[PDB]
Design a protein around this ligand. Structure first.
Ligand SMILES: CCCCCCCC(=O)O[C@@H]1[C@@H](O)[C@@H](O[C@]2(CO)O[C@H](CO)[C@@H](O)[C@@H]2O)O[C@H](CO)[C@H]1O
Ligand SMILES: *Cc1c(COP(=O)(O)O)cnc(C)c1O
Ligand SMILES: *Cc1c(COP(=O)(O)O)cnc(C)c1O
Lengths: 406, 405
């Protein structure tokens, strides 16, 4: 039995019909579905332990459960210390925290920030805000012949002015896996800091922050089987220690006087106000769930699905597939594409009639799409609960859609 | 049958035993418990509609999520749902105003009036703003009933007052500050006004048009909603002029390599994937509360408040902080200290009787220094609490005093 076959019973949302057909959820790059383990953890907390994180029993229970999550996350990405993990609402907030706390205070006029043409808006806009306020300037790494990170071009962008390199780990559109470790090596040699947007890798790819040696890394819980409302920032302790606080308020202080306040120690320093307690505990359950399956196992299964998907799409003559072909190596378990003479919106709408859920649009990578004159694109994205049978249903619906518009 | 008697069955967490006794949850000012209606809403979403907010699931998730904003707008009588911005908690909401408006509208010498009773979340952000802009903080003192001293507030107003930020109802003193009059006076002085309504939103009817505050913040976890969701209310004209805070997906209109354009309100201030399920749950919380009626909730809490204070006032070893409910309307809570006994020991001991209260400074450290107290014990109620529970609390407190005598 496939990995999916063994866990699909864990996801109640998968067992339903859409427009008369069984749901085929292929929009996992947008957000993931949740297993009972996660939902029951959420319900159990609210029905038995809910209290702020105290002398009374409920507070003790809520506090123990909540505090246990940080090390689960630290171990999940192999962080040196849980003190290097900061909870946020989502990855976007995590990137903004770095931009506002570190960026606004460490970048001066003329300083260069190297990013890529494929970035998600959340790892671009914050930097455009920083640039506008500090005078820093942005440079963009182009795509290579395999529609992936152009490492040689990246090398040409490095200079004495390079102070920050912020790049997506795995593209939510192209699906290319960027050379995070080597990028960090080259950046550090140039004297720059490196932030890695791992929203698409954290849920599908084994992560080792000590190995890639990134200075910061961000991820969103909703894409890795956790509820929305929780994400996290990973930052080298020394860097977070030097960075000034961002949000101010309860819980992030040590002492407060009318005339001044002192900041608390890491990681509390960056977490203001009552945390998303239940959501954090659920994230811990998500991490536990994924670790039990094994990230290497999840990845191996996705690789199999990825080859099947691309092989099937490659046989449809009207299709243009974006990003590197699986044959060349590791890539995301997704496929973005366009059908000649047919707008992606029509493709997405029609397959939905067969119960297939895919996404059309620019996937929050408008500059990338505009750069190659693509009026958005259709994207089918997988997770470990998807099957080859579902991919076939999708391919059949797509072929039918093409017939309809022919 | 009391209001509590009619709703306690809706809260599953209340039906359990702690240390051999039925749970008596009196720490609602820290966080509230949730009714089944809210928890089922959350669970239903994840088990049926979870998707980004356009295939079927996406449509269902989007319709559910979009309906929440007007529920919140109506709950506080905002003129438009475009004036409601979702945040993780009230603290984030305050920081948003501090960074977006504060850092850009306050210059050296400008004055910010706040109070000595403020929660750290409505103080630290302004200290951060003052340190960067040169703005100066002024503090309204407590009156003889340990409440907002309106006369002193008037003496602080000057041609330099640009911002007045005050708590509506103190989480420590329980005093109800005259928000409407404070706003009227501040505006006449040419200043903007932010009201921290974290303790009023869950217990007291709110009307931002009547109060005429420029911004108002609240936390969902204190008003029967999940943790992870809160909101900022802001007069549309002010939010329209305020520059974006967080940048990223969802808050833009268009993004180019060299610049971006911002989306319209309220999207302008919500970056990245929102807390979808949690917002939908907040909507259920608002509906639940509205069904009960905030005025009815308030009326019941007032009844419990007199009962609580009469009982506590009759224990000689106690020092109660804030206005007596017979001095004026106040919050359904009581912060106090037992002579010669640390609040932590009091909280720890009543917990042995299954009673849950809080000790510490409740994030109002500066305030506690004024009473030469490192902290205080606080029993805080909600509409599912009863007079019987208050009596159990009083008996446990008396027993605790005997233990340490
Ligand atoms: C959905 C939005 C993203 C679309 C991304 C399209 C990327 C793309 O067009 O990039 C080209 C890449 O295909 C490749 O181009 C060709 C044809 O495949 O291959 C050679 C170079 O080997 C070119 O002569 C040819 O156009 O390489 C281009 C240069 O790196 C790259 O821009
Ligand atoms: C509880 C409380 C807050 C808390 O904000 P959170 O962000 O929920 O932690 C702020 N102000 C007052 C008056 C409060 O009672
Ligand atoms: C989904 C996505 C994000 C999103 O951030 P959120 O805050 O969860 O909306 C950022 N970067 C990439 C590469 C993504 O795929």
């Amino acid at each position: 039995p496939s990995l999916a076959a063994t866990v699909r019973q864990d996801f109640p949302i998968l067992n339903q019909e859409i427009n008369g057909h069984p749901l085929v959820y292929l929009d996992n790059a947008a957000t993931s579905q949740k297993p009972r383990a996660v939902l029951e953890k959420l319900m159990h907390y609210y029905e038995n332990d809910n209290a702020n994180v105290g002398a009374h029993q409920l507070s003790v229970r809520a506090t123990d459960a909540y505090e246990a999550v940080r090390n689960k996350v630290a171990k999940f990405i192999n962080a040196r210390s849980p003190r290097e993990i900061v909870y946020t609402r989502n990855a976007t907030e995590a990137i903004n925290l770095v931009a506002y706390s570190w960026g606004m205070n460490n970048l001066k006029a003329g300083d260069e920030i190297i990013t890529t043409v494929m970035e998600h808006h959340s790892n671009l806009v914050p930097w455009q805000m920083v640039a506008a306020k500090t005078g820093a300037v942005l440079k963009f790494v182009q795509l290579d012949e395999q529609e992936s990170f152009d490492l040689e071009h990246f090398k040409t962008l490095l200079s004495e002015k390079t102070k920050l390199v912020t790049v997506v780990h795995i593209s939510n559109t192209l699906g290319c896996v960027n050379p995070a470790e080597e990028i960090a090596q080259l950046a550090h040699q140039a004297g720059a800091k490196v932030l890695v947007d791992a929203c698409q890798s954290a849920p599908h790819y084994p992560l080792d922050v000590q190995l890639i040696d990134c200075d910061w890394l961000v991820a969103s819980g909703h894409k890795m089987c956790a509820p929305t409302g929780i994400g996290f920032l990973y930052g080298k302790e020394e860097i977070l220690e030097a960075m000034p606080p961002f949000f101010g308020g309860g819980e992030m202080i040590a002492e407060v006087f009318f005339d001044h306040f002192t900041t608390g120690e890491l990681p509390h320093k960056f977490e203001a106000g009552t945390p998303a307690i239940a959501e954090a505990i659920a994230l811990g359950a998500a991490v536990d769930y994924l670790t039990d399956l094994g990230m290497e196992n999840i990845h191996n299964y996705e690789v199999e699905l990825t080859h099947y998907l691309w092989q099937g799409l490659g046989q449809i003559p009207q299709l243009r597939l974006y990003g590197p072909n699986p044959k060349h190596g590791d890539r995301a378990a997704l496929a973005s594409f366009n059908v000649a003479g047919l707008h992606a919106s029509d493709v997405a709408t029609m397959v939905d009639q067969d119960g297939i859920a895919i996404r059309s649009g620019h996937h929050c990578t408008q500059p990338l799409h505009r750069l190659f004159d693509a009026s958005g694109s259709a994207r089918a994205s997988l997770y470990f609960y998807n099957t080859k049978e579902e991919i076939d249903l999708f391919l059949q619906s797509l072929q039918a859609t093409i017939r309809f518009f022919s």
